[PDB]
Amino acid sequence: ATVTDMAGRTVTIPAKVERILLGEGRLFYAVSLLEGNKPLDRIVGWQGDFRKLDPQTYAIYKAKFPQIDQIPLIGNTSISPEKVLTLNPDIAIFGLSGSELVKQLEKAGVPVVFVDFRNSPLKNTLPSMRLLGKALHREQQAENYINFYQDNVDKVTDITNKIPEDKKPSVFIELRAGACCGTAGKGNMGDFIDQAGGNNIAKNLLPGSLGTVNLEKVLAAKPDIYIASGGKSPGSDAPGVVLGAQVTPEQAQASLQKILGRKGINTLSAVNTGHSYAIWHNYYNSPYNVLAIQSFAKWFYPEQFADLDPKKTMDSLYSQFLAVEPSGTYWIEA
Ligand SMILES: [Cl-]
Ligand code: NA
């Protein structure tokens, strides 16, 4: 009847939950692990980020669940309402930031539950999933995913927790690489570099999980490994790495060569020797991020993780927890 969410708030959990509001649409990723073969049946409204900013994954779901388009889009605009109480929701899910709708929902006695996959994903990913298991009456499903997640993160931290600091390769990840050089320090994808045995150039070169750092000159740190994140669609014309549910290995590869073609970056040692990589950006706010930890690791220590196939982890994730087929490309090499 009560949970403590990742904001420390105490929240009563109604006995019946069938109408879920998503205050950030891409919280569908977390919900989708709990919902089995009926991923949309309980979403009565979401903020539009998932439909508009991950159109590739959305389209995969549309092809199988056409009713996805009628799920109302919460916003002020394109958006379909912004007075959610008329959806009579049982519960609402938000991510921690790093607001007004939340206070209004409290007044009406709607339980608002805060999760977090973005600020401190190492600390918060599994507590957020167990929290959602409790608040949405999917405890066994949450625990199932937690064991799958823990077992697949163990496959990595079993090896990289015993690696000396001098052997750790230096790593710079460029977030949203196309706008230079925004990154993550103590947190967000920094956690994934930490878990995967790497040394993040910006690990304390900024006091926070997300931020932007000085341009590519500070990449005279000669990182052993280069990593760019993006989730643009093919033919987008808008600059950025091209990854997602509808991207081919070749289409991903052509976008990475071009991002590695920019000035300065094409002088880095990791670029001209084949140590450059691209990762799906939505791993930065999603409990699927285990796939990015495993991808980082296999890149950082190839010989030591040569038995570890992240595509096989992903196939097993979809097989066990999701209603759609794995498609597209979410990481790529150079
Ligand atoms: Cl974003
Ligand atoms: Na999905």
Numbering used by the authors: 1 to 77, 81 to 101, 108 to 188, 192 to 346
Question: What do the authors of the reporting publication say about this deposited model?
Answer:
Structural alignment analysis reveals that YiuA has the greatest degree of structural similarity to cluster A-2 SBPs, which bind chelated metal.
The YiuA crystals that belonged to this crystal system had unit-cell parameters a = 41, b = 95, c = 172 Å and will be referred to as crystal form 1. These intermolecular contacts do not involve helix 5. The total solvent-accessible surface area (SASA) of one molecule in YiuA crystal form 1 is 14 481 Å2 and the cavity SASA is 2682 Å2. Based on these measurements, the dimensions of the YiuA cavity resemble the dimensions of the HmuT cavity, which accommodates a hemin complex, and are considerably larger than the YfeA cavity, which accommodates a metal ion. Atomic distance measurements between the Glu109 and Glu228 C∊ atoms, delineating the base of the cavity, increase from 36.7 Å in crystal form 1 to 40.8 Å in crystal form 2.
